């Protein structure tokens, strides 16, 4: 033929069949032992998610949400993702004492449901009403963005203490139980309005620590609705929403490390 | 074009002096007119040689920039700029990826260009050396007056004059001469002075006395002649053009390189476009379809391989430089290993090029002297009183002297003023009797008759050094038979005795044997003149026989020859044991050529020519079956009337071939004949008459000390110490580097698979990219470099000089067996070890292997800063990318770890590491430096930006260890099978 | 620890780099030693 005879062509096939078969069987074996060394409830390493990311619902083309108020299908793209998220926080999804629980309607302290063990059933998560998100189809004019803190197993988000000076200096400082979120731009051509649990501009600490998908399915993380009823129009406004805390940090590279990058433009 | 120049020349030495003048419109006495000479100048053109048109270095450099790998790397470099252009227009990408990768790849092409350019070097100044043989000026007779003119202004027809010490300015017809002798070594390779006279003495113009040639010099006397040829039209000017004009051609090693380039280029374009369409079918945007292709290019092309080859060659050439063997062309480092036929000059190559005493006949006994340079033999006789009598004649009846200031150099190597035979005798006595000058001071010469054409003897009368005599001793030497007709007694073991027919017959026997050995034989005799008949003041007349020259006492015979170099016989046998055919090709006479052939082992004992059979059986040569003769001796005059097909039959039908009295073109023809049969041929030589053959040879080797400038220009290799044993070393080195290149190539190729497979699974699996493009270049250009080079220092696995020369048609540098092992077996194991570490990194950070399938869409989505892992955690864009790049880093390090084992297995093709050992210090160096480089690239701060290399946790380093070990075991088991059964299965499938 | 389990999300990449570079250097020196056993 090309290389060899039929007899040789066969033998080279019988070899590579057994050979690659063995190699596949060995590869699988090493994957088995790897998995055997891992927990079902907690990942081996967590230093790469460490400082929590802050992500929002409006799916930004490039950290930007520009549209026209005087146009219907101009914002119907951002309403798709906005709906996708809030559709999960339905009351019909949170039914019965299992696996949900009614928690303080005001920001409270942490809740420990034991260890990362299966020695108990599904760890009961705090309910969250999308109805706590006042004012927010969504904002056809002047968007109503929804913030979110990235989930990390066993992470206890710790707010800053009012020992020294603060950006939003001491205003509504629920020091003990709220992780604040203050959006900014100089360039003050807007109108910041925050909505959340208990009416505070933060995340209620009663939703922590997260026990993971395996030990807490259907779990709901707290949301923080933000509305920009800015009196300006037809210009790119670089708005940055920042979260503050002891376990919260940022990076010049990762522009989502505990903060937002939104470029709103109501070009109408 | 040069087929005309490969033919024997035609001449006009047969014409009379007068007749020759009519042909050139010339005067025998007055010479040309100033006006007629200038007319002929403009007519024929200058008496000069024009160098052939060369290829500029520009075109030579750029021709390498387009050879398979460079072509693919160019397509990659441009395709980078393509994707970059498409980006800069569509979505403003502030990145530098495609732009920088395009710059990097273009640089890789340029630098790789320098390496191949350095390897494909051609240092040739043939025509320049020939031009150096034309004198600046010549002496001509114009308008009846002699004047010096620019030799280029010399034309056919003018009257030229030459004298001892000057170069022949052009081909001349001798019309007048006085004691003129010439050095025709340019045409023959033999430096013994040849007389020139107006008389025609041979039909063959290269042998007649009435022609003098350009490229030669007058050694003594004076001559006048008419110019018959000028410039390019001279006999050796044509040889110049032939030699300088010959197409170089591709080396065996070069052909091998291009061959695997085709193979690897083939699989590259195959998988390249095979997966380019496979991606579009899967619905991949052309934006991405090209990005994957660039990666495929980089994965398939072994970026550092061609440069490795060059370095391995260079390092092999450095070792040979250290044995006095200079390599002018890097590729010639290997040709000697692939050589199946050596065509060797005799004089100054196989031989020392110096008349040396070989045997002596005295006391009715043949004695042998030591002919070797360094005198590696033993003594023959010292005791016999006869010896001292013969020794005295050899010293006394000798007019040769050592040049001043030689006392530093060895006797046999020092320059001597005199003819070759007298120098030989001088050096013979000086060696075994001490200072000859002393013997010539103790015995003052009073009268002598120098060797005469008519007398055929030379005699001398000396004052006997003996005090009790202080009388007159007569000594003489000459033609053995002439000396015999002048002897009455023979000095036997001390005492004289009558010359009976018995001893006279033993003389003839001794004389015939020595002459049969191709040796020049001389007779020696002396006579103690009677005291009473010769007073202490008796005057001797040299002009008229004033003393007896008959009834003298015969002392002995001495024989001499230009002997082989000490190492030559043994080197010839070694070449022949390695299955190399050795042919002699010489301008010298057949009797001498044949005798040295037997001396060095070109013709082995018992082997006969058709002429030998005929003489032994006493029958006509036509009655001899030529197939009964494995040896042959072909004279150039017969070679001339043979067609190439008939030359091919001679080459095919004889194992032991001697081509004697060959011209320079004839040497070229013999070389081409050998090549025509498909053989790789080496030429060894030292003369300008070797230049065409040296050029045409696959590898020409010139002698460094004895070699002429031309020969060393025409060669690929120079033996700087004239050590012929270096050929044996060269062939051995050549074979070793050929095997080691295979090892180094397999090693380099093996790591291509773990660079290809990640890109494929990236498409077919939709997982995060396991390894990056930049990461690949860190391997092929970084870590693999020193290890790959180090394989050039591997010792032989067996006695390589015991095997036959490779068949260049069947035995390739890269074959299917190499690809099967490198791509199908070992590289495949490396790929898995890479993937394993990849799955380990991701799974330990929260992305278990199961959830990875079909996630790249969301993984690469820059706007999704919340991807969910297996444990329910959310990752931003840059966070997961850090883990991904950490995966690139550990996959990279996995390659390094699996290359550890590969380096050790590529060490040997057959033998076990437990047999070959670990005595390669460069290889071990490679292991340490490779690992140091990898660690540095991972842990050095800032490398995460420039190369996207991230720090690895200690446990990460050990992921591929079990795969590294399986490689070592697998290959060790496999080679154990090879050795345990030379049959073929494992052998014919995987044996590189 | 409980709410004070910050060490769980921390890794000393600084020490690892220092050690990694020490090792790389020493492997580089060791290599020179073995190579220079004859040049
Ligand atoms: C989650 O809540 C949303 C609230 O808008 C539900 O949307 C409803 O969709 C139905 C049918 O398309 C409409 O008739 C209603 O007007 C919507 N709102 C309400 C309050 O009922 C959505 O269907 C819910 N999703 C799930 C899975 O239950
Ligand atoms: C990533 C995976 C799926 C690709 C696997 C590719 C396999 C099938 C390839 C890789 C190397 C290949 C072999 C390389 C060498 C030879 C020897 C030659 O004389 C005949 C073909 C043969 C035997 C090839 C057959 C196919 C082969 C085994
Ligand atoms: C939000 O909606 C409420 C009614 O639910 C209305 O009273 C109020 O004006 C709205 N706020 C703004 C800022 O438009
Ligand atoms: K050559
Ligand atoms: K490679
Ligand atoms: Mg010679
Ligand atoms: Tl490569």
Tally of helices (H runs) and strands (E runs) in chain A: 2, 10
> Six-digit token pair at B146?
């002699």
B639 in a structural domain? yes
Residues with Cβ within 8 Å of B199's Cβ and at least 6 positions away in sequence, in order, are B209, B210
Q: How far is CA A27 from CA A17, A22, A33, B899, in A?
A: 15, 9, 10, 18
8 Å CB contact between B291 and B769: no
- For chain B, the first-to-last Cα distance in angstroms comes to 43
Same-domain check for residues B394 and B510: yes
Same-domain check for residues A185 and A114: yes
Could you give the dihedral angle defined by the CA atoms of residues A102, A104, A107 and A109, in that order, rounded to the nearest 10 degrees?
A: -90
What is the tally of structural domains in chain B?
Answer: 4
State which residues form the domain around B706: 340-352+564-724
CB atoms within 10 A of CB B590: 19
B53 in a structural domain? no
Q: After which residues is chain B broken (C to N over 2.5 A)?
A: none
Closest C-alpha among B154, B116, B21, B455 to residue B311: B116
Residue B401, phi-psi category: left (phi > 0), alpha (psi -120 to 50), beta (remainder): beta
Residues with Cβ within 8 Å of C39's Cβ and at least 6 positions away in sequence, in order, are none
B495, burial (CB in 10 Å: exposed 0-12, middle 13-18, buried 19+): exposed
Residues with Cβ within 8 Å of B107's Cβ and at least 6 positions away in sequence, in order, are none
Residues from chain C contacting residue A45 (CB–CB below 8 Å): 11
DSSP character at residue B959: T
Please name the residue that has the structure tokens 């799916």. A59
Instruction: Write the DSSP assignment of B68-130 as a string of letters.
Output: THHHHHHHHHHHHHHHHHHHHHSS-----HHHHHHHHHHHHHHHHHHHHHHHT-----HHHHH
What is the best residue among A130, A131, A135, A199 to mutate for testing ligand 3's pocket, by most ligand atoms within 8 Å of CB? A135
Closest C-alpha among B786, B789, B756, B792 to residue B773: B756
Chain B nearest-CA distance from A163, in A, is: 31
Closest C-alpha among A148, A144, A90, A123 to residue A216: A123
8 Å CB contact between B214 and B170: yes
Regarding the beta carbon of A87 and ligand 1, being less than 6 Å apart is answered yes
B171, burial (CB in 10 Å: exposed 0-12, middle 13-18, buried 19+): buried
Provide the edge-to-edge strand list for the sheet that holds A223-228. A146-148, A223-228, A192-195
B134 in a structural domain? yes
Chain C CA closest to residue B932: C24
Same-domain check for residues A171 and A217: yes
Instruction: Tell me the count of A-C CB pairs closer than 8 A.
Output: 21
Same-domain check for residues B493 and B432: yes
User: Of B513, B543, B563, which marks where a domain is finished?
Assistant: B563
Same-domain check for residues B214 and B226: yes
Chain B nearest-CA distance from C25, in A, is: 7
What is d(CA B85, CA B99) in angstroms, rounded to the nearest whole number? 9
Closest C-alpha among B199, B194, B229, B192 to residue B214: B229
Residues from chain A contacting residue C8 (CB–CB below 8 Å): 46, 154
Q: Does any CB of chain A come closer than 8 Å to the CB of residue C14?
A: no
Same-domain check for residues A266 and A182: yes
Closest C-alpha among B125, B8, B15, B106 to residue B65: B106
Q: Note if B612 is an active site residue.
A: no
Residues with Cβ within 8 Å of B212's Cβ and at least 6 positions away in sequence, in order, are B162, B168, B171, B172, B174, B182, B196, B218, B223, B225
Mutate which of C12, C16, C18, C24 to disrupt the B interface (most B C-beta within 10 Å)?
C24
Task: Please tell me the residue having the least CA distance from ligand 3 atom 13.
Answer: A229
Chain B CA closest to residue A148: B866
Instruction: Write the DSSP assignment of B595-652 as a string of letters.
Output: HHHHHHTSS-TT---HHHHHHHTT--GGGS-GGG--EEEEEHHHHTT--HHHHHHHHH
Same-domain check for residues B858 and B755: yes
Q: How far is CA B429 from CA B383, B447, B599, in A?
A: 15, 22, 24
DSSP character at residue B815: -
The dihedral through the CA atoms of B535, B538, B542, B544 has a sign that is negative
What is the tally of structural domains in chain A?
Answer: 2
DSSP character at residue B34: H
CB atoms within 10 A of CB A195: 19
Q: How far is CA B151 from CA A66, B41, B63, in A?
A: 91, 12, 41
B42: domain CATH number is 2.70.150.10
B773, burial (CB in 10 Å: exposed 0-12, middle 13-18, buried 19+): buried
The dihedral through the CA atoms of B59, B63, B64, B66 has a sign that is positive
What is d(CA B696, CA B239) in angstroms, rounded to the nearest whole number? 13
Closest C-alpha among A89, A15, A24, A47 to residue A247: A47
Q: Are strands B631-635 and B401-402 parallel, antiparallel or unpaired?
A: unpaired
8 Å CB contact between A157 and A109: no
CB atoms within 10 A of CB B534: 16
SS3 B708: coil
B57 in a structural domain? no
B628: domain CATH number is 3.40.50.1000
Closest C-alpha among A216, A27, A51, C9 to residue B849: A27
For ligand 6, the distance from its centroid to the CA atom of residue B344, given in whole angstroms, is 9
- Which chains form contacts with chain C, at 3 or more CB pairs under 8 Å? A, B
Same-domain check for residues A108 and A230: yes
8 Å CB contact between A56 and A147: yes
A153: domain CATH number is 2.60.40.1660
- How many residues does the structure list for chain A? 268
Same-domain check for residues A5 and A71: no
B626 half-sphere exposure, CB direction, 13 A CA radius? 8
8 Å CB contact between B433 and B391: yes
For ligand 3, the distance from its centroid to the CA atom of residue A220, given in whole angstroms, is 26
- E strands present in B100-216: 137-142, 145-150, 159-163, 171-183, 194-195, 211-212
Same-domain check for residues A69 and A24: no
* Domain boundaries defined on chain C: 11-35
What is d(CA B561, CA B572) in angstroms, rounded to the nearest whole number? 20
> Six-digit token pair at B864?
């999704």
Task: Please tell me the residue having the least CA distance from ligand 2 atom 19.
Answer: B816
Q: Is the peptide bond before A99 cis (omega within 30 degrees of 0)?
A: yes
Chain B CA closest to residue C17: B939
Residues with Cβ within 8 Å of A55's Cβ and at least 6 positions away in sequence, in order, are A147, A148, A150, A256, B865, B866, B874, B876
Cα–chain center distance at B288: 53
Partner-chain residue, chosen from C5, C10, C11, that has the shortest CB–CB distance to A154:
C5
What is d(CA B115, CA B110) in angstroms, rounded to the nearest whole number? 9
A13-23 core/surface letters (b: 16 or more CB in 10 A; e: else): eeeeeeeeeeb
What is d(CA B938, CA A202) in angstroms, rounded to the nearest whole number? 40
Cα–chain center distance at B65: 28
For ligand 1, the distance from its centroid to the CA atom of residue A92, given in whole angstroms, is 10
What is d(CA B718, CA B721) in angstroms, rounded to the nearest whole number? 9
Same-domain check for residues A230 and A199: yes
Selected catalytic residue, list B27, B171, B345, B784: B345
User: Of B563, B594, B623, which marks where a domain is finished?
Assistant: B563
Task: Please tell me the residue having the least CA distance from ligand 3 atom 2.
Answer: A135
Residue A161, phi-psi category: left (phi > 0), alpha (psi -120 to 50), beta (remainder): beta
Same-domain check for residues B499 and B422: yes
Same-domain check for residues B661 and B776: no
Question: Could you give the residue ranges of the DSSP H alpha helices within B715-824?
Answer: 725-750, 753-765, 773-778, 785-790, 816-819
What is d(CA B160, CA B227) in angstroms, rounded to the nearest whole number? 7
Regarding the beta carbon of A236 and ligand 1, being less than 6 Å apart is answered no
Same-domain check for residues B217 and B261: no
Residues from chain C contacting residue A51 (CB–CB below 8 Å): 9
Same-domain check for residues B498 and B600: no
Per residue, what are the HEC states of B839-871?
Answer: HHHHHHCCCCHHHHCCCHHHHCCCCCCCEECCC
What is d(CA B494, CA B474) in angstroms, rounded to the nearest whole number? 17
SS3 B246: coil
Q: Ligand 2, closest atom to CA B817?
A: 17
DSSP character at residue B32: B
Same-domain check for residues A99 and A155: yes
Residues, beta carbon < 5 Å, ion ligand 6? B 189, 345, 347-348, 686-687
Residues from chain C contacting residue B939 (CB–CB below 8 Å): 16-17, 20-21, 24
Same-domain check for residues A7 and A45: no
Closest C-alpha among B750, B763, B377 to residue B566: B377
The helix or strand, by DSSP H or E, that contains position A80, with its residue range, turns out to be: helix A76-86
Same-domain check for residues B948 and B850: yes
State which residues form the domain around A69: 39-268
Closest C-alpha among B591, B586, B413, B584 to residue B519: B591
Question: Could you give the residue ranges of the DSSP H alpha helices within B906-981?
Answer: 913-916, 921-939, 943-946, 961-980
Residues with Cβ within 8 Å of B262's Cβ and at least 6 positions away in sequence, in order, are B68
8 Å CB contact between B32 and B26: yes
Q: Are strands A125-126 and A100-101 parallel, antiparallel or unpaired?
A: parallel
8 Å CB contact between B694 and B685: yes
What is d(CA B707, CA A211) in angstroms, rounded to the nearest whole number? 89
Residues from chain B contacting residue A64 (CB–CB below 8 Å): none
> Six-digit token pair at B395?
């010293």
Q: Does any CB of chain A come closer than 8 Å to the CB of residue C10?
A: yes
8 Å CB contact between B215 and B688: yes
> Six-digit token pair at B822?
């490198």
Q: At CA B469, angle to CA B468 and CA B475, rounded to 5?
A: 140
- For chain A, the first-to-last Cα distance in angstroms comes to 72
Same-domain check for residues A175 and A106: yes
> Six-digit token pair at A184?
């900014």
Q: Which residues face B344 on adjacent strands?
A: B584, B684
User: Of B213, B245, B277, which marks where a domain is finished?
Assistant: B245
The helix or strand, by DSSP H or E, that contains position B593, with its residue range, turns out to be: helix B590-600
Same-domain check for residues B132 and B167: yes
B463, burial (CB in 10 Å: exposed 0-12, middle 13-18, buried 19+): middle
Same-domain check for residues A118 and A22: no
What is d(CA A251, CA A52) in angstroms, rounded to the nearest whole number? 11
Measured in angstroms, the resolution is 2.5
Question: Could you give the residue ranges of the DSSP H alpha helices within chain C?
Answer: 13-35
Mutate which of C4, C7, C9 to disrupt the A interface (most A C-beta within 10 Å)?
C9
Q: Ligand 3, closest atom to CA A229?
A: 13
8 Å CB contact between B654 and B582: no
Same-domain check for residues B764 and B666: no
Q: Which ligand is nearest to the CA of B675?
A: 4
Q: Which ligand is nearest to the CA of B346?
A: 6
Same-domain check for residues B750 and B788: yes
Same-domain check for residues A227 and A196: yes
């Amino acid at each position: 033929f090309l290389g060899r005879t039929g007899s040789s062509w066969f033998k080279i096939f019988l070899f590579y069949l057994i050979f690659y078969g063995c190699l596949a069987g060995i590869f699988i074996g090493t994957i088995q032992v790897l998995l055997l060394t891992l927990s079902d409830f907690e990942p081996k390493y967590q230093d790469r998610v460490a400082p929590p990311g802050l992500s929002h619902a409006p799916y930004a083309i490039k950290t930007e949400i520009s549209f026209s108020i005087s146009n219907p299908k101009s914002y119907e793209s951002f309403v798709k993702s906005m709906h996708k998220l809030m559709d999960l926080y339905n009351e019909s999804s949170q039914a019965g004492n299992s696996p949900f629980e009614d928690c303080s309607d005001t920001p409270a302290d942490y809740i420990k449901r034991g260890d990362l063990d299966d020695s108990q059933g599904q760890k009961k998560a705090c309910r969250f009403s999308r109805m706590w998100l006042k004012n927010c189809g969504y904002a056809e004019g002047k968007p109503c963005v929804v913030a979110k803190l990235n989930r990390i197993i066993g992470f206890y988000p710790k707010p800053l203490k009012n020992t020294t000076d603060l950006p939003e200096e001491l205003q509504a400082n629920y020091n003990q139980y709220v992780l604040p979120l203050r959006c900014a731009a100089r360039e003050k051509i807007g109108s910041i309005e925050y909505f959340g649990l208990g009416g505070y501009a933060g995340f209620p600490l009663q939703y922590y620590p997260y026990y993971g998908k395996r030990l807490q399915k259907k779990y709901l993380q707290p949301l923080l609705a933000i509305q920009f009823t800015n009196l300006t129009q037809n210009m790119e406004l670089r708005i940055e929403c920042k979260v503050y805390g002891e376990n919260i940090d940022y990076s010049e590279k990762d522009r989502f490390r505990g903060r937002f990058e939104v470029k709103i433009e109501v070009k109408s | 074009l040069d087929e005309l120049k490969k033919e024997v020349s035609m001449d006009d030495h047969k014409l009379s002096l007068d007749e020759l003048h009519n042909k050139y419109g010339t005067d025998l006495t007055r010479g040309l007119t100033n006006a007629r000479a200038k007319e002929i100048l403009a007519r024929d053109g200058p008496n000069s040689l024009t160098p052939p048109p060369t290829t500029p270095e520009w075109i030579k450099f750029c021709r390498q920039l387009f050879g398979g790998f460079s072509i693919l790397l160019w397509i990659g470099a441009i395709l980078c700029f393509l994707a970059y252009g498409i980006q800069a227009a569509t979505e403003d990408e502030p990145a530098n990826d495609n732009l920088y990768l395009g710059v990097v790849l273009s640089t890789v092409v340029i630098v790789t260009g320098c390496f191949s350019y350095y390897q494909e070097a051609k240092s040739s100044r043939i025509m320049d050396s020939f031009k150096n043989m034309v004198p600046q000026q010549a002496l001509v007779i114009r308008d009846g007056e002699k004047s010096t003119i620019n030799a280029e202004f010399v034309v056919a027809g003018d009257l030229v004059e030459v004298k001892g010490g000057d170069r022949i300015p052009a081909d001349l017809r001798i019309i007048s001469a006085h004691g003129c002798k010439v050095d025709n070594s340019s045409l023959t390779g033999e430096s013994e002075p040849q007389t020139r006279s107006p008389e025609f003495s041979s039909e063959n113009p290269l042998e007649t006395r009435n022609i003098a040639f350009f490229s030669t010099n007058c050694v003594e006397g004076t001559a006048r002649g008419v110019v018959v040829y000028t410039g390019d039209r001279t006999v050796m000017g044509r040889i110049a053009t032939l030699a300088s004009g010959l197409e170089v051609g591709r080396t065996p090693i070069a052909i091998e390189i291009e061959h695997f380039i085709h193979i690897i280029t083939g699989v590259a374009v195959f998988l390249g476009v095979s997966f380019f369409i496979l991606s579009l079918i899967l619905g991949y945007s052309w934006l991405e379809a090209v990005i994957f292709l660039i990666g495929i290019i980089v994965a398939n092309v072994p970026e550092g391989l061609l440069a490795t080859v060059t370095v391995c060659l260079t390092l092999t050439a450095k070792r040979m430089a250290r044995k006095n063997c200079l390599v002018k062309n890097l590729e010639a480092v290997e040709t000697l290993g692939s050589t199946s036929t050596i065509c060797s000059d005799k004089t100054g190559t196989l031989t020392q090029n110096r008349m040396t005493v070989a045997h002596m006949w005295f006391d009715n006994q043949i004695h042998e002297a030591d002919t070797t340079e360094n005198q590696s033999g033993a003594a023959f006789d010292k005791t016999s009183a006869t010896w001292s009598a013969l020794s005295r004649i050899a010293a006394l009846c000798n007019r040769a002297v050592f040049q001043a200031g030689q006392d530093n150099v060895p006797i046999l190597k020092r320059s001597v003023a005199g003819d070759a035979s007298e120098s030989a005798l001088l050096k013979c006595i000086e060696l075994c009797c001490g200072s000859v000058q002393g013997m010539r001071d103790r015995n003052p010469k009073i009268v002598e008759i120098p060797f005469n054409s008519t007398n055929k003897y030379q005699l001398s009368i000396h004052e006997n050094e003996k005090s009790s005599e202080s009388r007159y001793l007569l000594v003489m030497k000459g033609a053995p038979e002439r000396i015999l007709d002048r002897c009455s007694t023979i000095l036997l073991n001390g005492a004289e005795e009558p010359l009976k027919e018995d001893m006279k017959e033993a003389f003839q026997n001794a004389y015939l044997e020595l002459g049969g050995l191709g040796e020049r034989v001389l007779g020696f005799c002396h006579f103690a003149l009677p005291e009473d008949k010769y007073n202490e003041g008796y005057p001797f007349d040299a002009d008229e026989p004033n003393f007896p020259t008959t009834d003298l006492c015969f002392v002995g015979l001495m024989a001499m020859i230009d002997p082989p170099r000490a190492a030559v016989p043994d080197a010839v046998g070694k070449c022949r044991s390695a299955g190399i055919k050795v042919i002699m090709v010489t301008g010298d006479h057949p009797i001498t050529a044949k005798a040295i052939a037997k001396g060095v082992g070109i013709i082995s004992e018992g082997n006969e020519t058709i002429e030998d059979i005929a003489a032994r059986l006493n029958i006509p040569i036509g009655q001899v079956n030529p197939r009964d003769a494995k040896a042959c001796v072909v004279h150039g005059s017969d070679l001339k009337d043979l067609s190439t097909e008939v030359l091919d039959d001679i080459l095919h039908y004889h194992t032991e071939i001697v081509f004697a009295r060959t011209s320079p073109q004839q040497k070229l023809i013999i070389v081409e004949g050998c090549q025509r049969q498909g053989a790789i041929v080496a030429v060894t030589g030292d003369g300008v008459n070797d230049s065409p053959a040296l050029k045409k040879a696959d590898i020409g080797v010139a002698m460094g000390i004895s070699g002429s400038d031309v020969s060393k220009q025409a060669a690929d290799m120079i033996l700087l110490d004239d050590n012929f044993a270096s050929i044996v070393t060269g062939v051995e080195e050549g074979r070793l580097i050929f095997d080691n290149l295979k090892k180094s190539i397999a090693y380099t190729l093996t790591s291509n698979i773990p660079e290809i497979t990640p890109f494929l699974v990236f498409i077919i699996g939709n997982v995060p990219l396991p390894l990056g493009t930049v990461t690949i270049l860190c391997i092929d250009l970084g870590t693999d470099m020193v290890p790959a080079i180090s394989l050039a220092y591997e010792q032989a696995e067996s006695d390589i000089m015991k095997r036959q020369p490779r068949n260049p048609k069947t035995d390739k540098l890269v074959n299917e067996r190499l690809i099967s092992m490198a791509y199908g077996q070992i590289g495949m194991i490396q790929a898995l070890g890479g993937f394993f570490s990849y799955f380990v990194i991701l799974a330990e950070n929260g992305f278990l292997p199961m959830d990875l399938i079909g996630k790249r869409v969301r993984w690469d989505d820059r706007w999704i800063s919340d991807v969910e892992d297996s444990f329910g955690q959310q990752w931003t864009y840059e966070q997961r990318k850090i883990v991904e790049f950490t995966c690139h880093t550990s996959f990279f390090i996995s390659i390094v770890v699996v290359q550890w084992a590969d380096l050790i297995i590529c060490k040997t093709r057959r033998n076990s590491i437990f047999q070959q050992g670990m005595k390669n210090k460069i290889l071990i160096f490679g292991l340490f430096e490779e690992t140091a480089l990898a660690a540095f690239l991972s842990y050095c701060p800032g490398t995460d930006v420039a190369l996207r290399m991230y720090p690895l946790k200690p446990s990460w380093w050990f992921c591929a260890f079990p795969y590294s070990l399986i490689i070592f075991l697998y290959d060790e088991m496999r080679r154990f099978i090879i050795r345990r059964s030379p049959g073929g299965w494992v052998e014919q499938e995987t044996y590189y | 620890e409980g709410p004070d389990n910050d060490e769980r999300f921390t890794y000393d990449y600084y020490r690892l780099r220092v050690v990694g570079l020490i090792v790389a250097a020493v492997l580089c020196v060791i290599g020179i030693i073995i190579l220079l056993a004859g040049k």
